[model samples]
Target: MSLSHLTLDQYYEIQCNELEAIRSIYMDDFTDLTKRKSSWDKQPQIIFEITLRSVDKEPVESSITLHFAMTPMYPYTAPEIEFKNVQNVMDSQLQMLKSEFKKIHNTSRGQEIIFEITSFTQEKLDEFQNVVNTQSLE
Candidate 1:
């Protein structure tokens, strides 16, 4: 069924269902997630607190929290992904991370980019293990 044929309520139902499906899948794979909303928000956002530990079972000290916000046009539009909490890193390092995500955000429009972005971020964080592990603030 094309979206053009759907009623307003039907469109909303589909949106809600798709969002729930995406959220459910992520919840199964990623823990330490908390959903939140503010009066100014169009949709609720999820905050993910992830710890990136090295393969040696030792601390990487690169734990970070990311914020994932969905727009009303979700699935049709890419999400608003940003870092909510980050360890103490140089301004350059933080800017680098922001630029990387910004690239993903732009190219990901009109695609199912949630899982892709999540996986990509973890890979980037792994690469930062050496630098961020020793340089984290939190």
Candidate 2:
């Protein structure tokens, strides 16, 4: 592909301007790509050590380093969000998640896959609140 037109600055501006779908988003650029706008670029993916807070706001789930392969003009497309470390998802939890996501994940084209987990303990819920407070712009 004639990817000479693509620049890291262009890519950064695109994703940076959008709200990060991954909680712990650690983005890296690929200077050694053989292609553009395709997952086959073999470039370093935007790695995410994703952590999800429960409904009460505590970190209850963490994905083992997920990869978001770079795609040109990818903002127009929906992201592929998968749930890992979902060992705690029983029937009740699944039903709740499905209902909530189905309801809110359709607010707009941007609201593709909104997800949340609930806490089993009040203490964990309280901790989640603190985490949210700390992880904000100063």
Candidate 3:
């Protein structure tokens, strides 16, 4: 089996800051991440609540807690993104994005899209951002 020596632990100090910087820099387009960057690496602080709202509607937050476990990375190469609760989601099949969305590369933007977080790596960070933005706009 293949393994990744790069764990989010050692990488967190550097990557968390770096990745968050990228998130903030493009916050307009990427508006759904933990507002506080430094708070993400509190180790035992596995749970993170992300607040987001719809642009056209009243502002409301939908929080999802992320449970982080560094060891036993066999199931995932990095932090895995999933819906902690889907009760709020309508239709259950409302054509939400999945890993497949990452594969498409937002081709409309072409090479210019390289500046966004999703462009850098599929860190699962931006996926939450997408959910937030989607709910915010809907």
Candidate 4:
């Protein structure tokens, strides 16, 4: 039997595994990975710039960048999430997006959730692009 007991190191191991998985799945979108400076623990940080387009003949695309940092107790506590608008996103819309992301994090604590967060952001951007396309036709 190769069973092993969990330890404090398991949290960091899980964090690294999740980061690698995210990078693999979002090769192009995942950008700017680095370790936090000026911190004794030196946790990993990442950025993802995701773009989505509307389902229309003249499809409109919107892009958003997500900045993420894992805390020492991440998964048990949600990673810090920041949003950067890349294309045609209003200030109010950005605020709303941040709130929605927080809601997801609050609800899904104790789990690896970067994939969920990025997917949700992509869906929202697609919806926004669709709305912009509809308004342009009006």
Candidate 5:
């Protein structure tokens, strides 16, 4: 069913439930993953951080953190994703990833996109790790 089929409250509830699923589904895959109510808007939000290490004698660990929020204008527009922390990283690589996330958002027009972006971010994890591995070594 399309988002147009649901009322505003239904849309909001779906987004909240979707975030809950994302938290549970990605918990094992990421170093830290959580979903909660945002203090700013009292809406649903998610934050995740992942650690990756290079293959070496003594591997160096790199961390990348990302944030997602479902605000009042959700399903119609993308949330402003935030980077809570980025270690062992460079500016350009982070910019690229940020751009990609922007691209991953709210294209459904009448459909909820939280789950879509969540899945896209999961696939993009490797790119983030690659940036960390290459940039940190230099």
Candidate 6:
């Protein structure tokens, strides 16, 4: 069958495989992986954490936890992403980051984009860290 048209079972299978691949890649950084159905749907929800580090005159580190839930048409649609346990970043900054997440999701529809999302967040954290460093130094 073509990827464009997958049955619900096929989608679940694909999601399982994708989750496993993500676990392997993130290892300890990927945590609290679970498959509890939400009241609105049978979509599996996952929570994971990623730690980011920035090295400069001094090293800065931050931890971000994400709560993600896949839609039945995920890969064909953008999954829901919620940022949690965000350290050293203001709520305003997180709003900006979430806006960028939507932009990334829009550009990467019809594909598994969790890796890209997390990677983008890591990059942003590094930038944020540098900004903090600059403010402290000045």
Cα lDDT listed for each candidate: 0.52, 0.36, 0.35, 0.63, 0.52, 0.63
**Per-residue lDDT of model 4, residues 1-138, tens digit only:** 332575546777777777788878877766654655455446444323333323343354455677667776676566677666555665555677777887788776767677777777777766776665344322
Please say which candidate is ahead in lDDT: 1 or 4.
4
For model 2, the superposed segments whose C-alpha errors exceed 4 Å read: 1-11, 17-42, 55-71, 91-138
Sort all candidates by TM-score, best to worst.
Answer: 6, 4, 5, 1, 2, 3
- Give the higher-lDDT candidate: 2 or 4: 4
What are the per-model C-alpha RMSD values against the true structure? 6.1, 11.8, 9.7, 6.3, 5.8, 5.4
Error of 4 at 50 (Å): 6.6
> Which stretches of model 6 miss by more than 4 angstroms?
1-5, 35-60, 133-138
Tally clashes: model 5: 0
**lDDT for residue 97 in candidate 2, whole number 0-100:** 44
Q: Determine which window of 10 residues in candidate 3 has minimal summed lDDT.
A: 66-75
Global fold similarity of model 3 (TM-score): 0.34
Ordering by lDDT: 4, 6, 5, 1, 2, 3
Better model by lDDT: candidate 1 vs candidate 3: 1
Clashing pairs in 6: none
Give the distance in Å from residue 10's predicted Cα in candidate 2 to where it truly belongs: 3.8
lDDT for each residue of candidate 1 in 1-138, tens digit (9 for 90 to 100): 466664444435544453465566655544444444334444333334333322232344445545554555554655565554565333455467667776776776645455556556666666666545353443
Clashes of 1: 0
Instruction: State the TM-score for model 4.
Output: 0.69
lDDT of 2: 0.36
Each prediction's TM-score against the native? 0.54, 0.37, 0.34, 0.69, 0.58, 0.71
lDDT of 2 by residue, 28-120 (tens): 311222333466545544422234434432343421112233345443443444344543333343343445543343553442222221222
Q: lDDT score, residue 84, model 6? A: 70
Off by over 4 Å in 3: 1-9, 22-47, 58-76, 84-88, 91-95, 101-138
lDDT of 5 by residue, 3-102 (tens): 5665676656656675556657666644433433243443234333433322332233344555555655566556656554555545665576677765
Against the correct fold, how does model 5 do in TM-score? 0.58
